[PDB]
Amino acid sequence: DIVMTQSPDSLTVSLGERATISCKSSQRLLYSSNNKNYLAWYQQKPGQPPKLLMYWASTRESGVPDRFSGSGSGTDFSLTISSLQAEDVAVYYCQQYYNPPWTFGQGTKVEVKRTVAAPSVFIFPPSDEQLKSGTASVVCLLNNFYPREAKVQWKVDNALQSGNSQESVTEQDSKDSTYSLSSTLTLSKADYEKHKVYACEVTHQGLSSPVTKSFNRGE
Amino acid sequence: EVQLVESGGGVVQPGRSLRLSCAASGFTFSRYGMHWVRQAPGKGLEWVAVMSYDGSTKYYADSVKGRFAISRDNPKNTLFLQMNSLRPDDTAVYYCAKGGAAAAVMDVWGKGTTVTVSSASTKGPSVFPLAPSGTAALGCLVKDYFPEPVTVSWNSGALTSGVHTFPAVLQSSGLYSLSSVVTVPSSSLGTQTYICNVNHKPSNTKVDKRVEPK
Amino acid sequence: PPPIDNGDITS
């Protein structure tokens, strides 16, 4: 079984700069009899299925832009994106097809490095609909910031909440290169009704001091 | 153009079986070898199996050899995967893939079907508004479903710009929750309708919710 | 060892 190893695991590139992804095969992928390397590259943008970019090491698939170049021979291969564009954020996979089992490299994530941007923060109360089931979700949205690192602190009538929230973060946006994050606080219906002021406090590099969005239950 | 649509995913209890299908269109299915490839969530691609054009030749990953059987039906343009003795680590998106003319590569992929092996059964979601009130935000909260995935589109797909749909979070209850939001200018809040279309195919749940200020 | 011939996979 032929082992494919990629390097590095992750690249963070400035717009217009060069990304270089390396792929190393545990077995020579060159066939003496036809002088072709049985190596392919795939691109998988966030939330989408993989697309074939390259085969025979360097032959571009139809529709692949000419900022992508595949090269190498033998055991050592390379995928280069000259002059990276925002669209190109993805995970890239090399793959040998010299022989079964077809095997993939572990994947290399590519992201854009960009200017610092502060999140826009939005707070949502639970709907009246939800309450009828015994529980309440308060949602706090951190929109289009950079870099990825960010802090959400929930407060309920000035009490700092912990252990009762969960967060998730989108993959970097393909046009403005930002991230977004949703945080959900969970409360019993009875608890949500006993308190008034619900607040989402946000810390991030692009803000000089924490931002707090709030609502009073009952509006 | 070439299309591969996978089907048959959902949740299965440990130990049991599941059959996936792949409806191929837009090419002569009879002339091409076809693959199954899978991807655990947040993880890499893993080749599963392949069957040749006329069906006389197969190969399987060691991971699945003897457990899985690839087959195909040429007159009906359909590729199958019969999966047996499933375990939680078989949990993944399963992509159907067409072989290249060309070279033994996968030149076209389906979007995949999501397979989940766990000790929990199908449960449809409830949908709750994330209500608004320069730039305003609204959304829907798609709550307490299993297994993955749900999809959310806005205004039947007409509204894409400024849409963010977040990775589902697994709650302490073992049920998923997913949030989808869109940002629009605040003066546009009552100026047109914003409707989130939610689908949870394992439960046959289909919801259109209009979101509005109070 | 020779690579497998794509012709045995797709015609």
mmCIF file of N, CA, C and O in Angstrom, chain A residues 31 38 97-100 102, chain C residues 1-6 9:
data_model
loop_
_atom_site.group_PDB
_atom_site.id
_atom_site.type_symbol
_atom_site.label_atom_id
_atom_site.label_comp_id
_atom_site.label_asym_id
_atom_site.label_seq_id
_atom_site.Cartn_x
_atom_site.Cartn_y
_atom_site.Cartn_z
ATOM 1 N N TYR A 31 6.182 5.496 -14.203
ATOM 2 C CA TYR A 31 6.209 4.251 -14.960
ATOM 3 C C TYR A 31 7.177 4.399 -16.123
ATOM 4 O O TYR A 31 6.929 5.169 -17.050
ATOM 5 N N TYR A 38 1.728 8.772 -11.976
ATOM 6 C CA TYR A 38 0.332 8.455 -11.713
ATOM 7 C C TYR A 38 -0.150 9.196 -10.470
ATOM 8 O O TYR A 38 -0.578 8.584 -9.486
ATOM 9 N N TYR A 97 -2.603 6.993 -8.186
ATOM 10 C CA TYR A 97 -3.504 6.012 -8.774
ATOM 11 C C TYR A 97 -2.682 5.026 -9.568
ATOM 12 O O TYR A 97 -3.147 4.402 -10.520
ATOM 13 N N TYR A 98 -1.428 4.928 -9.160
ATOM 14 C CA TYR A 98 -0.517 3.951 -9.687
ATOM 15 C C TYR A 98 -1.091 2.537 -9.508
ATOM 16 O O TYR A 98 -0.955 1.694 -10.385
ATOM 17 N N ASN A 99 -1.755 2.299 -8.377
ATOM 18 C CA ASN A 99 -2.160 0.949 -7.972
ATOM 19 C C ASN A 99 -3.151 0.925 -6.812
ATOM 20 O O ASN A 99 -3.028 1.707 -5.878
ATOM 21 N N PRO A 100 -4.118 -0.005 -6.846
ATOM 22 C CA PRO A 100 -5.011 -0.126 -5.692
ATOM 23 C C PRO A 100 -4.280 -0.560 -4.429
ATOM 24 O O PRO A 100 -3.295 -1.289 -4.501
ATOM 25 N N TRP A 102 -6.291 3.002 -4.154
ATOM 26 C CA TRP A 102 -6.119 4.428 -4.381
ATOM 27 C C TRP A 102 -5.964 5.071 -3.018
ATOM 28 O O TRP A 102 -6.708 4.734 -2.105
ATOM 29 N N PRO C 1 6.949 -2.912 -10.068
ATOM 30 C CA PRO C 1 5.615 -3.374 -10.484
ATOM 31 C C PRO C 1 4.878 -2.334 -11.330
ATOM 32 O O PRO C 1 4.767 -1.191 -10.904
ATOM 33 N N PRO C 2 4.386 -2.738 -12.513
ATOM 34 C CA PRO C 2 3.620 -1.898 -13.436
ATOM 35 C C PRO C 2 2.328 -1.366 -12.803
ATOM 36 O O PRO C 2 1.667 -2.108 -12.085
ATOM 37 N N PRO C 3 1.984 -0.104 -13.081
ATOM 38 C CA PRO C 3 0.736 0.493 -12.598
ATOM 39 C C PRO C 3 -0.442 -0.215 -13.252
ATOM 40 O O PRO C 3 -0.284 -0.802 -14.323
ATOM 41 N N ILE C 4 -1.613 -0.185 -12.651
ATOM 42 C CA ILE C 4 -2.708 -0.828 -13.334
ATOM 43 C C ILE C 4 -3.159 0.041 -14.506
ATOM 44 O O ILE C 4 -3.079 1.272 -14.475
ATOM 45 N N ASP C 5 -3.574 -0.627 -15.569
ATOM 46 C CA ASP C 5 -3.938 0.040 -16.805
ATOM 47 C C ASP C 5 -5.370 0.518 -16.665
ATOM 48 O O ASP C 5 -6.256 -0.282 -16.357
ATOM 49 N N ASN C 6 -5.588 1.813 -16.876
ATOM 50 C CA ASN C 6 -6.915 2.423 -16.716
ATOM 51 C C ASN C 6 -7.944 1.725 -17.591
ATOM 52 O O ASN C 6 -9.124 1.678 -17.259
ATOM 53 N N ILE C 9 -10.296 -0.579 -16.095
ATOM 54 C CA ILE C 9 -11.225 0.090 -15.193
ATOM 55 C C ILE C 9 -12.318 0.817 -15.974
ATOM 56 O O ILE C 9 -13.505 0.705 -15.657
#
